[PDB]
Design a protein around this ligand. Structure first.
Ligand SMILES: COc1ccc([C@@H](Cc2nnn[nH]2)NC(=O)c2ncnc3[nH]ccc23)cc1
Ligand SMILES: [Cl-]
Length: 163
C-alpha cells in the first residue's frame, strides 16, 4: 500500500494516468462505447477480451501487466433513483475489492454514472460520496480524473474538507 494513503484530483484524460492501474467506466457488454470507455479502449484495447460484466460489478482484465478494472455503473435513464443508487454504491465496492486483490499502491478512477449514464442529472456529489465510502478502507493512493473545470474545483474542495 501507499505510505500515507491519499486522494488527489486531476483534470485530464485518464488514458494518460500516472497510476499502477486504471478503472474504466465500462458498459455491461464490454463494447468500446464513448467518453472514458472509448479513451480506455484506444489506450488498452487488449483489456476488452471477455470484459462484459453486469451492472454493479467490476471485472479486471490485464493489458500486458497493466490492470484495467472495468466498473459498470447503472445508467440512470433505465434505473429508478433508489435502485440506481444501490447499484452505483455496489460498483464502487467491487472496485475497492479489485484494487485490494491486485496489491497496487495507486489507482486512477473516473466518476461512475456521470455523463451519458447520469439520466440528465448532476451526480458529482452522489458518485464521489460512493467512491469515498468504498475506497476509504483501502490503502492505495487514489487519483480521480475529470474533464470539467468546475468539477475539478468541487472534487478538490470535497477532498480537502475531510483532511
Ligand atoms: C457514463 O460514464 C461516464 C463516466 C465519466 C464521465 C465523465 C465525468 C466528468 N465530466 N467532467 N468531469 N468528469 N468523465 C470523462 O468523460 C472523462 N474523465 C476522465 N478521463 C477521460 N478521458 C476521456 C473522457 C474522460 C462520463 C461518463
Ligand atoms: Cl488531456
Amino acid at each position: 500500500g501507499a505510505m500515507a494513503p491519499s486522494y488527489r484530483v486531476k483534470r485530464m484524460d485518464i488514458a494518460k494516468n500516472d497510476e499502477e492501474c486504471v478503472v474504466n467506466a465500462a458498459n455491461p457488454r464490454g463494447l468500446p462505447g464513448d467518453g472514458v470507455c472509448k479513451a480506455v479502449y484506444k489506450k488498452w484495447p487488449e483489456s476488452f477480451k471477455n470484459s462484459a460484466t453486469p451492472v454493479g460489478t467490476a471485472k479486471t482484465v490485464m493489458c500486458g501487466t497493466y490492470p484495467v478494472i472495468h466498473a459498470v455503473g447503472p445508467n440512470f435513464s433505465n434505473y429508478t433513483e433508489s435502485e440506481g443508487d444501490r447499484e452505483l454504491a455496489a460498483a464502487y465496492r467491487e472496485v475497492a475489492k479489485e484494487v485490494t486483490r491486485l496489491g497496487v499502491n495507486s489507482v486512477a478512477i473516473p466518476l461512475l454514472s456521470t455523463g451519458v449514464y447520469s439520466g440528465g442529472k448532476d451526480r458529482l456529489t452522489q458518485s464521489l460520496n460512493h467512491l469515498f465510502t468504498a475506497m476509504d478502507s483501502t490503502d492505495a493512493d487514489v487519483v480521480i480524473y475529470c474533464r470539467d473545470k468546475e468539477w475539478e474545483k468541487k472534487i478538490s474542495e470535497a477532498i480537502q474538507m475531510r483532511t
